[PDB]
Amino acid sequence: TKPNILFILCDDMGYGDLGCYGQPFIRTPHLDAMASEGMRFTQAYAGSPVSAPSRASFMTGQHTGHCEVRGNKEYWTNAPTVMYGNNKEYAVVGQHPYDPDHVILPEIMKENGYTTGMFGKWAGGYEGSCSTPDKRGIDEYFGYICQFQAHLYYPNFLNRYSKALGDTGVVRVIMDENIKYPMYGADYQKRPQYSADMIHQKAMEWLDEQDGKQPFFGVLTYTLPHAELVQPEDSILNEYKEKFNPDKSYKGSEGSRYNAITHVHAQFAGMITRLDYYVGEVLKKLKEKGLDENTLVIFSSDNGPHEEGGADPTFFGRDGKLRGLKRQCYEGGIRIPFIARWPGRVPAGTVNDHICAFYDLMPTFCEIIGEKNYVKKYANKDKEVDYFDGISFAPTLLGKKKQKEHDFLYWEFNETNQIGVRMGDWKMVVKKGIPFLYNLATDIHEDNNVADQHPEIVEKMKAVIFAQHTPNPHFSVTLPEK
Ligand SMILES: O=S(=O)(O)O[C@@H]1[C@@H](O)[C@H](O)O[C@H](CO)[C@@H]1O
Ligand SMILES: [Ca+2]
């Protein structure tokens, strides 16, 4: 009968920003109940310390030493204008496209008889590119094609692809009341069409059309709690304007599409309690429709905590254990919350220390849906080598037999010019070609560089960097000396 699978992947949430992982100032009751009926992962990693490559890793089953997308690259900077009211907007939006000759996860599900849904941020390819959801195995899409467009929670348009409405490809749905008002300044909050509510409703309409004939695969890529720090001025926000006193404000960034706002500690806390509430409505709806015993639901985040649009990770991180933010190959930039729930399949109230990353999700779903020897089926014969880097963690997720272990995890990132490797207790961060070494068992906060005492380990972990990194012309890093 094949099981349904939902993956809820949010935007710029830290390892320590949820209650069940140890946040002290924000309520997350729906996700904490999910973990209490679920399995909570303690050593789970993003594909990258930043959005586009992390999402590419998940989609491709490849690490950033091999992947086509290894960073954020914009294709809208020199696009022509289009006017929505008095608002000058970009006529083509989005980021670098996925390689059309390497398979992604939505296309494997389609081959296996699933119907496919995706609600929120795409960030896999610009409008008109070789990689938009219509061409890469998505039946029903609604949200933001472009990472930069997602900066505004009250935008001029959102993107749609709907077989059901007989769209021939991606269109723009114009937000008719928003366009009457500026994009920046005092009058911006006169915009009434809030993106995260409108995108959550479309996801919920899709789900209510589902029944126990065809299996369904859903990607809920909601933008909370990414900047800007603007939302509805309702009860959720007011609870936190109460708890936090005094509070700070944000001056704004017109060039970054982050609007000025007051009570920034209140804004950020409200945005996480709002996302928790959405996840409450998903889990209830699955029970309401008799879907709960045959649906796997996973919650995670695309990278480490942020400091954009008035965010204050220092205040919210008071009791946290990990070093660093988004963009850093330090543990705080890559390690993320990961919760799984499947009544009577995934054991309830469990913690799981298995060392795993987003590039492991492709083989994990393949093993769950019955699709055997996926590499030989989907690998491209016209390539000199078609890399697949993942190991399935389906065994440990069902607490059964034969869990296999990585020799290493690997990450590289251009903006901070860093490389990260984890090999058991040992962790390497290369900065501008110089290796730093830490033991995570004696030093989780990565305070003591012990490269001096451990040269045999340093060379081994360089031997991994040399074997795993391939040329990519679009994104570059400095390798250490041989
Ligand atoms: O989470 S990320 O998408 O990496 O956030 C980044 C954001 O920090 C940066 O300012 O602009 C890019 C645009 O591609 C993304 O929106
Ligand atoms: Ca992100």
Last residue of a domain, one of 406, 439, 457: 406
Distance between CA 358 and CA 37 in Å, rounded?
Answer: 23
Same domain, 350 and 451: no
CA-CA-CA-CA torsion sign (265, 270, 272, 273): positive
- Same-domain check for residues 158 and 204: yes
CA distance 140 to 205: 11
412 part of a folded domain: no
First to last CA, the chain: 54
Residues 349 and 459 in one domain: no
Give the experimental resolution in Å: 2.3
Domain end call among 406, 433, 452: 406
Asked whether the bond before 246 is cis by omega within 30 degrees of 0, the reply is yes
Task: Determine whether 372 is exposed, middle or buried from the number of CB atoms within 10 Å of its CB (0-12, 13-18, 19+).
Answer: exposed
- What's the 77 CA to ligand 2 centre distance in angstroms? 20
Residue 205 burial (CB count, 10 A): 12
Our measurement of the distance from residue 364's CA atom to the centroid of its chain's CA atoms, rounded to an integer in Å, reads 17
303 labelled as ligand-binding? yes
Residue 74 is classified by DSSP as B
**Closest residue by Cα to residue 108 from 482, 333, 388:** 388
177 Cβ partners below 8 Å, 6+ apart?
191, 192, 193
CA 464 to mean position of chain CA atoms? 26
Angle at 200 between CA 25 and CA 69, to 5 degrees: 85
| C-beta of residue 386 within 8 angstroms of C-beta of residue 358 | no
Q: In terms of domains, do 436 and 400 share one? A: no
Nearest CA residue ID for atom 11, ligand 1: 148
Rounded Cα distance, 87 and 183, in Å: 7
Show Cβ contacts of residue 19 under 8 Å, excluding neighbours closer than 6 positions: 26, 27, 28, 29, 31, 32
Q: Whose CA is nearest to atom 14 of ligand 1?
A: 147
Q: Is residue 51 part of a domain?
A: yes
Q: Taking CB atoms and a 6 Å cutoff, what residues make up the pocket around ligand 1?
A: 11-12, 50-51, 72, 95, 147-148, 226, 256, 308
Q: Are residue 227 and residue 96 in the same domain, yes or no? A: yes
d(CA 93, CA 148): 8
- Closest by CA position to 273, among listed 50, 22, 29: 29
Distance CA 349, CA 360 (A): 23
Give the β-pairing of 426-431 and 434-439: antiparallel
The answer to whether residue 236 is domain-embedded is yes
| 351, two tokens | 């913690």
Nearest 10 degrees: Cα torsion 308, 309, 310, 311: -40
Classify strands 171-174 and 157-162 as parallel, antiparallel or unpaired. antiparallel
Single out the residue of 269, 129, 265, 279 nearest to residue 196, CA to CA. 279
Whether residues 428 and 346 fall in one domain: no
82 - beta bridge partners? 89
222's CB contacts (< 8 A; 6+ apart) are 8, 10, 11, 119, 120, 121, 196, 199, 200, 275, 278
Q: Examine the domain organization and report whether 255 and 340 are in the same domain.
A: yes
CB–CB of 418/430 below 8 Å?
yes
Question: What phi, psi does 298 have (nearest 5°)?
Answer: -125, 135
**Cα–Cα distance for residue pair 276/21, rounded to 1 Å:** 14
Q: Does one domain contain both 370 and 466?
A: no
Q: Method used for this model?
A: X-ray
Distance from the alpha carbon of residue 460 to the mean position of ligand 1, in angstroms: 34
Beta-carbon contacts of residue 64 (< 8 Å; ≥ 6 apart): 47, 48, 53, 57, 70, 410, 411, 412, 413
Structure tokens at 264: 């920034």
Q: Cα separation of 62 and 454, whole Å?
A: 30
The answer to whether 132 touches 170, Cβ cutoff 8 Å, is yes
Q: What is the DSSP string of 225-254?
A: TPSP-----SHHHHHHHHH--S--EE--BG
* Beta-carbon count within 10 A of 16 CB: 22
Closest C-alpha to 270, from 231, 227, 315: 231
What are the CA-CA distances from residue 107 to residues 167, 212, 372, 451 (Å)?
Answer: 19, 21, 15, 44
Residues 311 and 458 in one domain: no
Which residues share a beta bridge with 412?
Answer: 419
Q: Smallest Cα–Cα separation from 278: which of 231, 325, 214, 320?
A: 231
Ligand 1, atom 9: closest residue by C-alpha: 148
Note whether 282 and 381 are same-domain residues.
Answer: yes
270: part of which helix (H) or strand (E)?
Answer: helix 264-288
* 399 and 464 within one domain: no
CA-derived radius of gyration, the chain: 22
Q: Which residue has the tokens 């904490």?
A: 32
Rounded to whole angstroms, how far apart are CA atoms 373 and 388?
A: 12
In angstroms, rounded to a whole number, what is the distance separating the alpha carbons of residues 298 and 279?
11
Q: What angle do CA 323, 325, 327 make, to 5 degrees?
A: 120
CATH of the domain at 441: 3.30.1120.10
Give the position, in ligand 1's atom list, of the atom nearest the Cα of 50: 4
112 is in an annotated binding site: no
Residue 11 annotated as binding site: yes
- Only one residue has tokens 């008799």, namely 290
Task: Assign residue 20 a region (left: φ > 0; alpha: ψ between -120 and 50; beta: otherwise).
Answer: alpha
448 Cα: distance to centroid of ligand 2 (angstroms): 28
Chosen domain end from 364, 385, 406: 406
Burial class (CB in 10 A: 0-12, 13-18, 19+), 211: exposed
Pairing of strands 350-352, 261-262: unpaired
Residue 411 lies in a domain: no
Q: Which residues in 380-416 are b (16+ Cβ under 10 Å) and which e? A: eeeeeebbbbbbbbbebbbeeeeeeebebbbbbbbeb
Report the greatest alpha carbon distance in the chain.
64
Q: How far apart are the CA of 157 and the centre of ligand 1, in A?
A: 18
The whole domain housing 58 covers: 4-406
Contact 19, 29 (CB under 8 A): yes
Kindly state the tokens that stand for 295. Answer: 């649906």
Instruction: Compute the distance between CA of residue 119 and CA of residue 200 in angstroms, rounded to an integer.
Output: 8
The answer to whether residues 250 and 260 touch, using CB atoms and an 8 Å cutoff, is yes
DSSP one-letter string for 103-162: --HHHHHHHTT-EEEEEEE--S--TTSS-STTTTT-SEEEEES-TTGGG-SS-SEEEEEE
Cα-Cα-Cα-Cα torsion 242, 248, 251, 255, nearest 10 degrees, comes to -80
Cα three-residue angle 75-253-258, rounded to 5 degrees: 70
The tokens 């933001």 sit on which residue?
A: 144
Tell me 327's DSSP state.
Answer: T
Neighbouring residues of 246: CB distance < 8 A, sequence distance ≥ 6: none
CATH of the domain at 376: 3.40.720.10
The count of domains in the chain is 2
Alpha-carbon distance 373 to 366, whole Å? 9
